[PDB]
Amino acid sequence: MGTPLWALLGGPWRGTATYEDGTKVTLDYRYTRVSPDRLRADVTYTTPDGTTLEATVDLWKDANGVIRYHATYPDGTSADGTLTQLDADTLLATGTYDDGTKYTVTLTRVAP
Ligand SMILES: [K+]
């Protein structure tokens, strides 16, 4: 079965993304739609160098049990990715932007 989709709903709705070089970015999010098979959230994060970015993210779990997401940004850009549970606290997120650029970050929910 793996990680239940609604596991993503718990705890404080804030986390940190850690990049390959150790850089960390804060993620603040708010769920706007919840159904047994699909979540949607508005996400805000401030990158290094101070740009503030907003995205709308749809999440679901495919029949192989993989948690997938599709993020859309105000400018029309999109990203498609997967979330893989590492331990109880952390997810591995790997995405591809519509320009072909890829990323890999870990996501950890801030402690309550
Ligand atoms: K944008």
Side-chain angles (χ1 to χ4, degrees), residues 2-112:
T3 290
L5 180 62
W6 282 21
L8 301 182
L9 290 170
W13 289 352
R14 139 173 278 165
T16 300
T18 309
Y19 285 86
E20 181 173 13
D21 69 8
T23 296
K24 289 170 181 209
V25 169
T26 300
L27 278 68
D28 293 284
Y29 47 101
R30 179 172 75 80
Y31 285 100
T32 53
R33 308 184 204 152
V34 174
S35 71
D37 296 311
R38 207 181 181 87
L39 312 175
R40 178 179 288 242
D42 294 342
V43 184
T44 316
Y45 58 95
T46 296
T47 53
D49 318 322
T51 296
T52 303
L53 306 90
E54 271 173 350
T56 303
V57 182
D58 289 288
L59 300 110
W60 66 100
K61 195 161 150 106
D62 76 10
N64 281 283
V66 180
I67 292 170
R68 300 198 176 269
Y69 65 91
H70 173 76
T72 72
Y73 293 83
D75 61 354
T77 59
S78 49
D80 282 297
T82 70
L83 297 170
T84 301
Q85 179 97 85
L86 299 183
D87 73 302
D89 292 280
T90 316
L91 304 175
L92 186 61
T94 69
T96 309
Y97 289 103
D98 65 339
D99 75 351
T101 312
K102 304 190 187 183
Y103 59 91
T104 300
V105 300
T106 67
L107 296 172
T108 313
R109 207 163 51 202
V110 171

